[PDB]
Swiss-Prot record, chain A:
Neuronal AChR is a heteropentamer composed of two different types of subunits: alpha and beta. CHRNB2/Beta-2 subunit can be combined to CHRNA2/alpha-2, CHRNA3/alpha-3 or CHRNA4/alpha-4, CHRNA5/alpha-5, CHRNA6/alpha-6 and CHRNB3/beta-3 to give rise to functional receptors. CHRNA2:CHRNB2 and CHRNA4:CHRNB2 nAChR complexes exist in two subtypes: LS (low agonist sensitivity) with a (CHRNA2/4)3:(CHRNB2)2 and HS (high agonist sensitivity) with a (CHRNA2/4)2:(CHRNB2)3 stoichiometry; the subtypes differ in their subunit binding interfaces which are involved in ligand binding. Belongs to the ligand-gated ion channel (TC 1.A.9) family. Acetylcholine receptor (TC 1.A.9.1) subfamily. Beta-2/CHRNB2 sub-subfamily. The record marks 110 as: Key residue for a rapid dissociation (K(off)) from the conotoxin BuIA. Component of neuronal acetylcholine receptors (nAChRs) that function as pentameric, ligand-gated cation channels with high calcium permeability among other activities. nAChRs are excitatory neurotrasnmitter receptors formed by a collection of nAChR subunits known to mediate synaptic transmission in the nervous system and the neuromuscular junction. Each nAchR subunit confers differential attributes to channel properties, including activation, deactivation and desensitization kinetics, pH sensitivity, cation permeability, and binding to allosteric modulators. It comes from the Eukaryota. It is found in: Synaptic cell membrane; Cell membrane. It comes from Homo sapiens. The record marks 58 as: Key residue that may interfere with effective access of the conotoxin BuIA to the channel binding site. Glycans are attached at residue 25. Changing residue 46 to A: Reduces CHRNA4:CHRNB2 channel opening potentiation by divalent cations. This is Neuronal acetylcholine receptor subunit beta-2. The chain holds residues 27 to 141 of 502 of the full protein. It is linked to Epilepsy, nocturnal frontal lobe, 3: An autosomal dominant focal epilepsy characterized by nocturnal seizures with hyperkinetic automatisms and poorly organized stereotyped movements.
From Swiss-Prot, chain B:
Glycans are attached at residue 27. This is Neuronal acetylcholine receptor subunit alpha-4. Component of neuronal acetylcholine receptors (nAChRs) that function as pentameric, ligand-gated cation channels with high calcium permeability among other activities. nAChRs are excitatory neurotrasnmitter receptors formed by a collection of nAChR subunits known to mediate synaptic transmission in the nervous system and the neuromuscular junction. Each nAchR subunit confers differential attributes to channel properties, including activation, deactivation and desensitization kinetics, pH sensitivity, cation permeability, and binding to allosteric modulators. Neuronal AChR is composed of two different types of subunits: alpha and beta. CHRNA4 forms heteropentameric neuronal acetylcholine receptors with CHRNB2 and CHRNB4, as well as CHRNA5 and CHRNB3 as accesory subunits. Found in two major stoichiometric forms, LS (low agonist sensitivity): (CHRNA4)3:(CHRNB2)2 and HS (high agonist sensitivity): (CHRNA4)2:(CHRNB2)3, the two stoichiometric forms differ in their unitary conductance, calcium permeability, ACh sensitivity and potentiation by divalent cation. Cells produce predominantly an (CHRNA4)3:(CHRNB2)2 nAChR. It is found in: Synaptic cell membrane; Cell membrane. It is linked to Epilepsy, nocturnal frontal lobe, 1: An autosomal dominant focal epilepsy characterized by nocturnal seizures with hyperkinetic automatisms and poorly organized stereotyped movements. Belongs to the ligand-gated ion channel (TC 1.A.9) family. Acetylcholine receptor (TC 1.A.9.1) subfamily. Alpha-4/CHRNA4 sub-subfamily. It comes from Homo sapiens.
Length: 115, 45
């Protein structure tokens, strides 16, 4: 129950926006920590100079307008959210062929009370 | 009094205050159970 009210409080289109990125104190840079994880190199079509890999890329960033008082909401720590609604710093290959650029799944994201 | 009319009223009342991403569970400590199965239609290649 309280999870639904939490989501409706955070995902308010009138209160929260998606197209603008967070920043405070005179447009401070938002650090985005990303690291890659190789699942399995599935093929190397050496004739076409194409390498096909399965990748898990993890991304961390601080965001302030998403915080909430954890005490009021039954002392919840982390909440799952969809990716299509909360802002996200785009990170994509450049030397990618095939036209495909973005990720495939658009997973849910974990959000703590700190932000 | 038609069946489809009552079914439409059900569908109207059911989606009144329902959210999608909210994981539907009574208490936070409680869990869900997902019964899971496969069926092989055809082995392509």
């Amino acid at each position: 129950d309280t999870e639904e009210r939490l989501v409706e409080h955070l995902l308010d289109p009138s209160r929260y926006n998606k197209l603008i990125r967070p920043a405070t104190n005179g447009s401070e840079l938002v650090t985005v920590q990303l690291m890659v994880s190789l699942a399995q190199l599935i093929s190397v079509h050496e004739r076409e100079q194409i390498m096909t890999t399965n990748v898990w890329l993890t991304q961390e960033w601080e965001d302030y307008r998403l915080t909430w008082k954890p005490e009021e909401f039954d002392n919840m720590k982390k909440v799952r959210l969809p990716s299509k609604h909360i802002w996200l710093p785009d990170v994509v290959l450049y030397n990618n062929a095939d036209g495909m650029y973005e990720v495939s799944f658009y997973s849910n994201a974990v959000v703590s009370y700190d932000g | 009094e038609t069946r489809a009319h009552a079914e439409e009223r059900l569908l109207k009342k059911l989606f009144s205050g329902y959210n999608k991403w909210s994981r539907p569970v009574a208490n936070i400590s409680d869990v869900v159970l997902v019964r899971f199965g496969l069926s092989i239609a055809q082995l392509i290649d």
